[PDB]
C-alpha cells in the first residue's frame, strides 16, 4: 500500500503557525522528491516548493518566502510544511506529492490537509423557518426550507424529518458573511403533506453541541 500520509485538518487564527506532516511508507523515500502543492478555494493548483531528499535542500517558489518553511526528518520518513504568521489567504488544502527524477510527474499524492484560518469563535446557528409566504403552488407541490445563519466552524448536518425526507431535499453549500457561515436546505413535498403532515428540519452543529429542530408551520 504505498501512500504519503498527511496529518489532519487544522483550524488556526492569524499569526499562529502550523506544522503539516507528510509521512512516506511503501517506497524508497530518498530517491524521489517531495513537492508541496496548494489548492485554494477557487484558485488553481499553485505549486509551492520541493525538497529533494539527496541534497536536503528546499527550492521554494518565492511567491512563498520566509513564512512557509519546508523541513524534513528523514530517519522517520516524514517531510513537513510549516507556515508562519498565517494570514487569511492560506485557507486551502495543501497536498504533498511524490515527484520523480526521470519523467518529472507527480504520481502518488497525499490526501490533503485543509488549513482554515479564521478569527470567529464558535457560534451556534440561528435556524429560521421558510414557509410559502402564502404564495400558492404552481404545480401540485410545495417547497419549504430552513435557513441556518451566522455559525462557525463547519460542518452543520441539516436533515429533514430525522432522515426520512431524502429525495427532494437540497442542502446548499455554506457561504461566509463576516467570519460566520450561512447555509440553507429545501424540501419539496406533495401538497397533500404540508400542512396536513408535519415537516421538521433538524440542524445539528457538532462543534458547539447544539441541535435545533424547527417545524415549518404556515405562512
Amino acid at each position: 500500500q504505498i501512500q504519503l500520509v498527511q496529518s489532519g485538518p487544522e483550524l488556526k487564527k492569524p499569526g499562529e503557525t502550523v506544522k503539516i506532516s507528510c509521512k512516506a511508507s511503501g517506497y524508497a523515500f530518498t530517491n524521489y522528491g517531495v513537492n508541496w502543492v496548494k489548492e485554494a478555494p477557487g484558485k488553481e493548483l499553485k505549486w509551492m516548493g520541493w525538497i529533494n531528499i539527496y541534497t536536503g535542500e528546499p527550492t521554494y517558489v518565492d511567491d512563498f518566502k520566509g513564512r512557509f518553511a519546508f523541513s524534513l526528518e528523514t530517519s522517520a520518513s516524514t517531510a513537513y510544511l510549516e507556515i508562519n504568521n498565517l494570514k487569511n489567504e492560506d485557507t486551502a488544502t495543501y497536498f504533498c506529492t511524490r515527484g520523480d527524477y526521470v519523467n518529472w510527474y507527480f504520481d502518488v499524492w497525499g490526501a490533503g490537509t485543509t488549513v482554515t484560518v479564521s478569527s470567529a469563535k464558535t457560534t451556534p446557528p440561528s435556524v429560521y423557518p421558510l414557509a410559502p409566504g402564502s404564495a400558492a403552488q404552481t404545480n401540485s407541490m410545495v417547497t419549504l426550507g430552513c435557513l441556518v445563519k451566522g455559525y462557525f466552524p463547519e460542518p452543520v448536518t441539516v436533515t429533514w424529518n430525522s432522515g426520512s425526507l431524502s429525495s427532494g431535499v437540497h442542502t446548499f453549500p455554506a457561504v461566509l458573511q463576516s467570519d460566520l457561515y450561512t447555509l440553507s436546505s429545501s424540501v419539496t413535498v406533495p401538497s397533500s403533506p404540508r400542512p396536513s403532515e408535519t415537516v421538521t428540519c433538524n440542524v445539528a452543529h457538532p462543534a458547539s453541541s447544539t441541535k435545533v429542530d424547527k417545524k415549518i408551520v404556515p405562512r
Binding site: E44, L45, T59, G110, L130, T138, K149, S184, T188
Partner: protein, 216 residues
Amino acid sequence: DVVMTQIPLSLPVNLGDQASISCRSSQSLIHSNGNTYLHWYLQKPGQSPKLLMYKVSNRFYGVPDRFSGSGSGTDFTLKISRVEAEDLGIYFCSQSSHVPPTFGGGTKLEIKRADAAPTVSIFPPSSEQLTSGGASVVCFLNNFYPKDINVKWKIDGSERQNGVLNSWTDQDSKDSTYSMSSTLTLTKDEYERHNSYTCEATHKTSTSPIVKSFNR
C-alpha cells in the same frame, strides 16, 4: 510562469460519447533534453488527483485503455474514447518543463441531459429573525439544467446589489440537474420601510424571465 489554460470549463457528455479536453501553453513544452513534459491529472470529487498521462502521450499504470494524448508545441488534447461513469471529474493538464511546474484551470466532465427550467420559490423573512433585527429574503432556483442562470433581485420596482449571496449545488446525481439559492439581506428596519420583493431568474428555458414575488 508558463500559463496553461484549459477549455471548456465544463463538458456536457452523454456516457458513451467520445470526449476531448484541450489544454494550451504560453511557452513551449519541448525541453532542451528533447522531451515535452505535459502531464494530465484526474481529480474525482473530494479527493487528491490521480496521474493519467505523462510526456504527452503516455498512459500511467492501470489508467484505462480509452484515453489518448496528442499535440505538440503548445496545443495538446486528451481524448477519452467512450466515456464510462468513473472518468467523471475535473481534468487538469500541467507543464513540468519550466520551473515552476504550473497547472491548468481544469475541465469538469458532467453528464448532459434535456433542458429543464428552474422551479423557483421566494420566501419572506421569518418572524423569528425580524424579532432580532434582520430579514433575509430567500429565493431557491431548483431543479434546472443547464448550469448558467442569472438571478436579478428586483427589490422595490428597482434592482438590488448587496446582501445577495449565492451558492449552487453540484450536478445533482439523481437527475443530472442543478440548483441555486440566493439570499438578499436587509436590516429588519430597512426591510419594513418597503413594498414588494422579487427574485427574478433569466435562463435558456424561458422566453421571458421566470420571476416570483411577495410584498407586505
